[PDB]
Design a protein around this ligand. Sequence first.
Ligand SMILES: *[C@H](C)[C@H]1/C(=C/c2[nH]c(/C=C3N=C(/C=C4\NC(=O)C(CC)=C4C)C(C)=C\3CCC(=O)O)c(CCC(=O)O)c2C)NC(=O)[C@@H]1C
Ligand SMILES: *[C@H](C)[C@H]1/C(=C/c2[nH]c(/C=C3N=C(/C=C4\NC(=O)C(CC)=C4C)C(C)=C\3CCC(=O)O)c(CCC(=O)O)c2C)NC(=O)[C@@H]1C
Ligand SMILES: *[C@H](C)[C@H]1/C(=C/c2[nH]c(/C=C3N=C(/C=C4\NC(=O)C(CC)=C4C)C(C)=C\3CCC(=O)O)c(CCC(=O)O)c2C)NC(=O)[C@@H]1C
Lengths: 158, 67, 26, 157, 157, 157, 161, 161
Amino acid sequence: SIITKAIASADREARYLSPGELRTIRDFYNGGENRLRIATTLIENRKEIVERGSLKFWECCPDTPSNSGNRTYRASCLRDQDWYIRLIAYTVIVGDVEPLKDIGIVGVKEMYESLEIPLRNWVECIRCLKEVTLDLLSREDAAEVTPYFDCLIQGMIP
Amino acid sequence: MRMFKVTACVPSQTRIRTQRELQNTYFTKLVPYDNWFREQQRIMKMGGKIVKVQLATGKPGMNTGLL
Amino acid sequence: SPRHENQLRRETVPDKYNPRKANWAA
Amino acid sequence: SIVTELILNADSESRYPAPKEIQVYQNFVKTGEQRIRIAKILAENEQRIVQNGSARFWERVPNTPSNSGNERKTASCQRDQGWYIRLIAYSVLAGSEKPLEEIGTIGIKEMYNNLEIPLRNIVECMRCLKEEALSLMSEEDALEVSAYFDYVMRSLS
Amino acid sequence: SIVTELILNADSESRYPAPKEIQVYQNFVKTGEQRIRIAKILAENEQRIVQNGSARFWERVPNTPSNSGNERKTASCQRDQGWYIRLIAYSVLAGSEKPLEEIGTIGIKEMYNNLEIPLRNIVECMRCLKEEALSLMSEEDALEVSAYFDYVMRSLS
Amino acid sequence: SIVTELILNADSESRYPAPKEIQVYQNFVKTGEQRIRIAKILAENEQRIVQNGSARFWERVPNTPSNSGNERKTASCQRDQGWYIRLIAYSVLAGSEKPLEEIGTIGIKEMYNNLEIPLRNIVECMRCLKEEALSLMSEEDALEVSAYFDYVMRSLS
Amino acid sequence: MQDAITALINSSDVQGRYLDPSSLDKLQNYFQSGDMRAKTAIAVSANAKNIVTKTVAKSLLYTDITAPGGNMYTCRRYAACVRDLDYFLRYATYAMLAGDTSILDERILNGLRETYNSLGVPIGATIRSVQAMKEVVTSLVGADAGREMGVYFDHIAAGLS
Amino acid sequence: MQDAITALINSSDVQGRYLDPSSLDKLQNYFQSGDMRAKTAIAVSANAKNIVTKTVAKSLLYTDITAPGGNMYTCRRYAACVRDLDYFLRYATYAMLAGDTSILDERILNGLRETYNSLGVPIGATIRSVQAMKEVVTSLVGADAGREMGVYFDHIAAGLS
Ligand SMILES: *[C@H](C)[C@H]1/C(=C/c2[nH]c(/C=C3N=C(/C=C4\NC(=O)C(CC)=C4C)C(C)=C\3CCC(=O)O)c(CCC(=O)O)c2C)NC(=O)[C@@H]1C
Ligand SMILES: *[C@H](C)[C@H]1/C(=C/c2[nH]c(/C=C3N=C(/C=C4\NC(=O)C(CC)=C4C)C(C)=C\3CCC(=O)O)c(CCC(=O)O)c2C)NC(=O)[C@@H]1C
Ligand SMILES: *[C@H](C)[C@H]1/C(=C/c2[nH]c(/C=C3N=C(/C=C4\NC(=O)C(CC)=C4C)C(C)=C\3CCC(=O)O)c(CCC(=O)O)c2C)NC(=O)[C@@H]1C
């Protein structure tokens, strides 16, 4: 988070938190309630988001292992979509990409290459999920949510 | 292997705070090609200035025989 | 307990008709 | 029903049914026996029609809600197909599209938009059902069925 | 424009504009510089918006008449996208959806059904165009542009 | 070349070529005729290998940028196949994978990710090319050629 | 139809007096809440179709109401129920913008029970659907704006019961 | 390096005087432009790899530079060019965010021209690719933000010339 980043920056220089860093931390603590409301909206609507986004993703990217007749593959893909929607909600709670990066961006390419799942298909699915999510968010809330989708997409692109 | 002959001046940005002993910061040396990108990035990020770069060893545009 | 081969059992009818095909193909 | 059509036509003019309307009524009531046979054919082959039409429709449009690995959605779509075959059988019995229109055409777009089922896919499925149903009757029996399937397809587009 | 709407509303009651109408008129003319700026942004970036929206839309809908190997169809689709951006710019200038509605929304379903362009595909393309266009607008400017894109999308579906 | 490798191995210890290096050098030198023959075979049959491997690879991987209906993409993929056959010929001549590493292996993943070419598809194409090329030479030559084909495939993975 | 300002003006006018400091404070509260009210109206307008879709899915679908013999059977009756839910959502948004429940009293609840009983429309299912719609809207716009919209959703539901 | 605020502060500090009204107006202009700068930085970060892909496709692919005998021949040199373009884009985003070209001088052009000259990297092709990157970024972020980013892309190109 930004709190952790500021504390680490202050610690490196063996100094207390400067007034500017404290002002930044205070601003994010003020915005915490709004971020919590946005994340609650994301969590309460995650099932519709995943349903619509998965239908769109199988329409646009049909040649994918989840869309291959295997029930297990389809179930795992849907579980992963729900997992990433929830992770984006939690990282919205925090206010920075650090939790989502630590849980599901660092090493995501290696994990899905070991699983033999194309990462471009994942990029397409995240794009569809982002579109569906943006459909049900205000522009102001989208300004908070979309960059995490973009961070995930960038971390997934080979 | 390809080698760069690099001249640089890399002053220390924290010598007052750490009170490290004074060191000569203007150097000329041979840097391997495989380390030159990282070395140049380090010099740039330390505020140093790269004065001269030459391809001391190797030929430009070589396709094989780099080892 | 040096043997674990009994736990490595790994992890049917297709759930989709005509898989891995695009809509409205010419 | 064509009988209701004749009665309401006479009522709009506040006159008794004219001899032409009585002639139409007599022809319809004497073709009712063939209409019952067509309705029985549709009823007894409903599952075959539904399965074959679903196979063809998923060949054309595989990425559809009824073919997304959700068993409930597949069951609901195939039940809808059976329901429309049922409504077309009703219309064959009644001699007009009024049963089909009143039960499954008025507000069909609104209902399927609320369900988030794209209407193009439903039109394609109706076309496949129409072909499957027509492959089970002579052309004379199939005139009415083709007309009613076209009516359903036009209501969705 | 909205001025025409106010004038016609006053004329319907055969009376001079009421204080509420004059207040609406003044509020509208107060924002002329902002409307002109938004229209300028839309006009300058029309081709970039069209290109980005086309790329996204062909990613989302691979089997569409635009993306079917016919260069004329692709050119016509991209011209349609440009024309709709132009109509949205007109609407932003006029302060109401009247230009867009009168030029490219009334009869849009009939025109695109005659051209055999599926309407769901056009709705998706409009969604991609809206996403590309709103990225160039500040938060103050995006309200009307998003509303008019939504107007087109609702007219199509 | 393996000669460069052994000379550099001797030089890293600041020492004249030891009997192990001299034995490796003599073994490599005495197979010059075989290596030149293999290189000639690869050069003469390059187009046949490319055509047959492209056919088999498009059969195995129909959904690839090569056969997506783009003539330039097909030509570029086939040129890449020919280039990799040429690099394998270079490696056969040199007795080591160093030409293959320095021309077609170091940074292959970065280059093909920039080009947006799936790496598994290139692996499958290399496998088909290896199957086609190994069928045009004896077992002893196949042992040497398959090593470098596997080197390419492993670098892609 | 009356909004918050018109209601306060009416109460002051029957007494023949200018707005007293209490009504002026209420007016200032309404003016301060106007920005949130406009944001909630925009949010509900943007998601009206999705709100009604989720309401039907979570309150009416796959029950005996949509089964044959149910009141949501046939396409016309399904579409009419969806239209009624649209009515409720739109008029709740109107009342939220106005800050007053007058429009619901004069345009939604007047004769609604008699009309529904005449048509055979299930009133309890309608109340449950309105509750589901309130829950969906609250999940969409947050707790505070959700509660503000729920005031008028509850007004509709209480009128129906 | 330096940003706009740091540059103004240093220019005022070398004279031992507070920020004169011209510097305060410049600081206000930078603060006003900061919203657009942050939006452009977000947009560029969200599309970095695609930007580099498009740059290579529209500037360097299918030319004599990727043919045998060209400097972008072999996979390692192609990868090196792509790496250089990635760094160019990231540092241009840094400079645009800072509103100052000093970081470009310190961490891009510091010995880069001499390295390219010693390596035989074609300077004309590099400038062409930087201009293509500027065009791609402009097509992504619009005309105004594209112009603002092109200021720093052109600074890079001029430094490499
Ligand atoms: C099948 C050809 C297509 C399709 C259908 C589909 N339908 C549903 C769910 C419902 N379908 C109906 C249909 C009717 N109600 C009526 O009164 C009539 C006229 C007599 C009809 C045709 C209803 C009411 C539902 C709601 C569910 C219920 O049983 O109450 C689904 C499931 C949607 C969901 O689960 O949300 C589907 C998938 N889908 C396709 O892809 C085909 C093109
Ligand atoms: C064919 C097996 C696969 C495939 C390939 C494909 N390649 C391109 C384009 C290029 N390929 C290269 C390759 C190389 N450059 C080098 O220096 C080397 C080392 C000797 C190689 C192998 C390059 C540089 C290009 C860019 C174009 C150019 O030649 O200047 C394409 C077309 C990409 C495009 O978008 O136009 C394709 C399709 N694609 C497959 O699907 C196969 C698995
Ligand atoms: C791509 C646009 C063009 C291209 C590039 C190219 N570069 C190299 C090698 C190097 N490039 C650098 C560059 C930088 N060092 C820095 O500190 C920075 C600032 C962030 C930059 C941009 C360096 C240091 C090297 C040498 C060391 C290394 O690569 O690790 C090559 C390879 C040259 C070779 O002979 O192998 C290439 C090809 N070449 C073109 O033709 C493009 C126009």
